[PDB]
User: Fold Gene 1 protein from Shigella phage Sf6.
Amino acid sequence: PSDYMPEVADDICSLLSSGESLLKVCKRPGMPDKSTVFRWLAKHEDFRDKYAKATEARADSIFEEIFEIADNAIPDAAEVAKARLRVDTRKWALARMNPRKYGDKVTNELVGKDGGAIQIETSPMSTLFG
Amino acid sequence: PSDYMPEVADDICSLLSSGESLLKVCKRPGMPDKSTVFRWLAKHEDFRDKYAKATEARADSIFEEIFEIADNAIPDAAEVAKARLRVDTRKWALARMNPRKYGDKVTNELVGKDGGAIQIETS
Amino acid sequence: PSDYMPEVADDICSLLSSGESLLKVCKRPGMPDKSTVFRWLAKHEDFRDKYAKATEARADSIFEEIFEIADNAIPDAAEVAKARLRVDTRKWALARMNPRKYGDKVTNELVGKDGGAIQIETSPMSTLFG
Amino acid sequence: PSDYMPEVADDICSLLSSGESLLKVCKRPGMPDKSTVFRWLAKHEDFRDKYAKATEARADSIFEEIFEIADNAIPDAAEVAKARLRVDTRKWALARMNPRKYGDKVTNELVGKDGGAIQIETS
Amino acid sequence: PSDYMPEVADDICSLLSSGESLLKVCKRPGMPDKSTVFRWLAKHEDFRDKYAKATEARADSIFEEIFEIADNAIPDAAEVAKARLRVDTRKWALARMNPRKYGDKVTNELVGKDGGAIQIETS
Amino acid sequence: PSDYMPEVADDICSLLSSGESLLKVCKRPGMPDKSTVFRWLAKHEDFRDKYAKATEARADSIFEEIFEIADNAIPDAAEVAKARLRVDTRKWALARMNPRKYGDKVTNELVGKDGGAIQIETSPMSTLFG
Amino acid sequence: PSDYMPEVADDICSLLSSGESLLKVCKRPGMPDKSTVFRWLAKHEDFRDKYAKATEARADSIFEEIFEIADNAIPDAAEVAKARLRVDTRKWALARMNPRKYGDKVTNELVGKDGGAIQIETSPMSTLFG
Amino acid sequence: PSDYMPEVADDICSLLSSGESLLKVCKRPGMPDKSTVFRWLAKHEDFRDKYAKATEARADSIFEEIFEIADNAIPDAAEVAKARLRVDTRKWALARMNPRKYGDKVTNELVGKDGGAIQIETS
Assistant:
């Protein structure tokens, strides 16, 4: 397909939601190529909105998938290395697909000199930096 | 089973809470598939919340799993690499399941130039 | 056991305090399974409090253990890799068991442009972000 | 072709937008070489901007590429190492092509000593 | 020996101070086991403090150990990996034993957009 | 050449702009050695300015090059390791050649205790740190 | 030696200044063991002061040494791994011996939402955190 | 040669400036040993400064060296590992020789909860 076809776009959203990657989806019978999908996205806000929803769902699906990829890895050096690459790629992508949920989490205990208060000295500007 | 069912959802939460993963909970007979569970979650805030707490319980179980996976790894190169991948995947996931509890922990001692006070100029 | 049994809970706390992991404890004669332990925790504040104390002690015990795991590792590739995994897992866990004591430690010397003062310019809000 | 041409430049943007890299776009017959494209960019702000947006489109294509490179890696030691290098190079590049979208994501919970309020003294 | 003893505790501190680990101190005849030492520490603030300072002394000894472990590693793959693990474990531990001395050290030059002043808007 | 020669300096800038490294450039017929190039830079502002422009262009050229080095790596352990070293070296250098463009990119969502507001307590100075 | 001996302490400072590690120094003819050195340090401020100076010099010496360890490594897998360990250990230690000089160096360009100004909203305290 | 000599020191700076390391400069006949150079530096501020600038020049030379070391690595496992160590050591050193130029570069987009404004409460 080249022309925008909502039924096809809807199927793409459903498959992505389940965790399937776009390039893999686009290899299925009757699907548009990825370039065409991105063109559809660019010109159709209805699709963009549903695709954004599908991306959130895709991330939640992948989050479960990474446990399976690790736990079921064939215990052969090259196969484990591949499983690691697949998991690392998904971890990286999840943080971008939903930063609030899957971004890194750090608690910073902020203290000052010698574990006392943070010491701050303010002074008049000494150069023209405005 | 596609239509939201408050009893099946409560059941899912109980299973997750006892350490079971979503994939296993859904592979059971009569259970909704993963896509359906996620849809339920999306369209019901009450399920979203109990599921969130079940997720924190799941995390506490996974935390104890990582010790076993590491300590009981088969001492063969690929099996140890696999165990490492299993543990690393769980560590990463734990931080997201309960950030307060399992996120990274850093203490930053903030000082200024040469260990003096932090120097600020404002316009 | 399924019913809450304080004497058993107390033994669990003592074993954890010495550095033993929960799943290993739960394999000992007469112990509840881990699911049951977590259920006991959920419903009994007396146990939760003692378990929190035991977790602090567990961390201090593990902190000593990591030296032994490294120093006594069998000098075989796979055994050293396993020892490393065991130590890395403990290091990660210790920071969560007692963040104040075992979290990362960084001293940040904060300076500004060209090693001078930190330059800050404040301006009226330019969008509605309140 | 050395002299700036508004149509060839628009063409380059369209090709980059469809996922094609600059090296490939320039290896085509009748196209400017890379050095010439960069010169054009330097001396025309209108091209700089459309090129920037084409770069963001390229990034969205590359994002989907990394899944394929990882999942379809040949399970041989060197081929997996190569796939890892290909993916790592793309991840790094993506952050620079669209920082808002593909940069690192961190949530920092900022607290003070012992989990109390952050303590500050000022002069 | 289970009951707190101020002389045995002072002894433990002296031994730790001279570089000896707790495991070794406790494996000695007549010494309390590790669990008992930790209990003492928990229920006596005076011991907690002298133990903390003995821990800083221990850290200074360990700091010099890492040079020896690295420089004198047997040049065999697994022995070097073991030496690396021994050193990495000590580096990590040192930061926690004396954060001021052995924690990470970073100098952050903080600037604003394009190297200008840091731009802040407040409500 | 030892004496500053603008035509040669100009050629150096052109080659660097295309992504070639300085030491490689200095091996070409008729080029000065690197020490001499740095001496020319030190004493000639016209060259320094053009060299700075060339460095920006060099970085943009290298940014494209890293894809090719990775994608075309010979699938042999040592050759892939070399390709990785070549790419990692370029990534590191690019951030220094143009920090604004090629530096690391992080979005920090800043929150306070328990995900609420950041809690700040100010107090009079308690030591002489001015 | 057990008793504090300034001439010996002075020699220790000179050897450390040249980059030699303490345990290696203490193996030389007539030197005290490390425990004794630390005892001398604890009780003699003259030695502590000179030892601190020696530590600064030691760091500058090691900074040059790391180039030699890397560049002269025997090109054998295990020997390169050992050289790497020796260099990594020194890099880590240098930052602690002289944090101002050998600590990590980062320039953070701080911007706000969408690359605009950093947006800050202040509010009355909503809990008792003073 | 132990006594500070202003001409030998200027010479050292010139050599370092041309890319030569201190070890090589000192292994030359008639030159002070490393310990003596460091002593000079300690007791003369004028030498400390010219040496600092010579160090920045040295850094600019080393920056170009890393490209050659990487690109010309012998494609053998241990030789590539050695080249990597040589490059990594230089990268680390460069940041300390000229922090402004060769330190790490990060752009931090600072936002508040949920991408809103950063929320602060003060006492």
Residues 45-71 of chain H form the longest helix (27 residues). The helical segments of chain H are 8-17, 22-26, 34-43, 45-71, 77-97, 99-102. The beta strands of chain H are 104-111, 118-122. The radius of gyration of chain H is 21 Å.
